[model samples]
Structures are given as C-alpha cells and as structure tokens.
Target: AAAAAMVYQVKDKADLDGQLTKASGKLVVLDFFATWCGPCKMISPKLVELSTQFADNVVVLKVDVDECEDIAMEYNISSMPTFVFLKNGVKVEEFAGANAKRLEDVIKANI
Candidate 1:
C-alpha cells in the first residue's frame, strides 16, 4: 500500500537538496513531521494518497524532524506536520496542520 505511493523519505539535507535539484520544473511537497506527533500520523495516509493521485505531476517527500533536526530547523519548521510546497527549488506555498481537504486543494491548485 505505502509502496504504491510516490512518497520518498529524505535521509539528510544533501538528499533533500538532491531531490529538489532533480525535480527542476516539477512541484515538490515536503512534509515536515515527527513520529510522536498525532496530527502528523493522522495525515500520513492523506500524503500517500496525494502522492499517488499526483504521481506524475508532483514529488512528495517526507522528512522526520527527529531524524533530521538540522533540516527542520533550516526550514524554520517549529511545528509538526508542516507542509511546504516548492517549485523549481523555490517555496511557493506552505501550511501547518492535518487538514486533508486543504492539502488536497493546494496540491490540485499547484498541479
């Protein structure tokens, strides 16, 4: 089920940067989350669904705040489950929460 989705777990800043670089003209949805965060867990399935739903048009990346604290801090992510949308290495939009409908709408609007 999870494997069917186009979501990728970023290992480190280098890996994250590489993905963004490779994504060139595409849309990237960077999900900033923590394992112990309840809202983050709730939106996990929605992220997966979105990855599959926009497989060709977008790149979905998940970053564990615990595992990559530097990355999280670099993005100034002080909250759990912050969704950052990027296009061509530039941040286009961002939001914090577990609102599935809002997330889907943002994705659709960008894609």
Candidate 2:
C-alpha cells in the first residue's frame, strides 16, 4: 500500500519547520539522529519502510542533531534516536528508541 511518499533529511530548524507546515493533516515523524550514533543506524531502515508503505498519510524526516542545533534545542534532545510525532504543527507524541516495534506502533496507530 504505497503512495508517493518520501523520507527527507532536514538540515536546520527552518527545514524541519517547513515540513510541518506542508504536512497539512498528515502524520509527520521526525527522526533525530547523529552520524556517529549507533542505535540511529538500526532504526533508519524500519522508519523509511514504514513511511514508504504508509505513503501520502505520513512524512518522515531525518534530522542530524549536530547539523541542526536549533532543532535539537527546540526538542530538548538528549538521546541518539528520538522520534517526534507531529500533526498540524504540533507534537502528538515523542519518544526515544531504536525499537522498530514501537516505531511501527506509533506510525501505524497515527497514520
């Protein structure tokens, strides 16, 4: 059940903000990651796959914490992999993990 969905890499707060604006009513999942983080590597593929399958209804963005200090600060991040679920410019849920099960749960439940 694929539509024209995609996972984008966010560079800064502006980039991340814009996606939320464009999401309209779709579920937006922000993956906060770092290049050197070990757990981040594990969840990347599952996140992409779920977002791809959910298509049109979900938008996933990968944000590098180091590269986007503004965004990291906004989220008050303190972990390697954090997933922030947003809808219509507001946060619906936030969690830290590399667990595909919970990822799928949240994404599936929302979108």
Candidate 3:
C-alpha cells in the first residue's frame, strides 16, 4: 500500500524538538538533507514517494541540515541524506545513505 506525506519545515532546534511530541504514536522518518549536496538532491523524489507510500504508519520529515544547523549538529550529521527513524519520539534506528530499499525496510520493520 502507498502512504500520504507531510512536509516538515524545520526552522530551528525548537521545531525538531516539537516533533518529538507531535510524532507520538506515529513512526517518524527524518531526512537530514542539504540543498547543496548532490546525493541529497538525487534522492529527493524517492523521499517524496516514500513519504506518500507510508503516510498511514509514518510521518516523513525533510530537514535541511544547513537551515537547521543546531539540530543537525545535535544529531552529529556530518554527511548529507541522513535518515533517522523514531518511534514515540525516541530514535529507534537511522542510516546515512540513499538506498530506497533500505529505507523502506526500516519503515516496514518499525511500522
């Protein structure tokens, strides 16, 4: 089945922190990306598709690492396209790559 998606515009650390509460009871998938990163740009469409494909079970978030430096630094995201998975506001797993299958696996595993 396919899922619906919601865009997460992270303006700051507070925005990310807010998601912790708002994301309760739903699986959260965060994409830590940067506009300048080639890989980040490359996987943008897949990210959107995944978001739409798993909307019922997961909340897909796209966070611009450059725009939200504090949260990026907090997560220690040294690379682009960092995918973070969370459940009930707590991180369950994460990866730094652009593999659609891997990402979908994580989503299915968690959901």
Residues 1-111, model 3: lDDT tens digits = 233446576788787779767877889888998888998888877777877777677787788887888788888888778998888877899899878788888988898
TM-score of model 3 relative to the true fold? 0.89
Predicted structure 1: lDDT: 0.90
Residue 18 lDDT in candidate 1: 97
- Candidate 1 steric clashes: 0
Encode model 2's per-residue lDDT on 39-111: one tens digit a residue. Answer: 9987777876887887779988888988898888889999879999998887889999799999889987887
* Sliding window of 10 residues with minimal summed lDDT for model 3: 1-10
All candidates: CA RMSD in angstroms? 1.4, 2.4, 2.2
What value does the lDDT take at residue 106 in candidate 3?
91
lDDT of 1 at 52: 83
**Candidate 2 colliding pairs:** none
For model 3, the local distance difference test gives 0.80
The residue ranges of model 2 lying beyond 4 angstroms of the native Cα positions read 1-5
CA-lDDT, candidates in order: 0.90, 0.85, 0.80
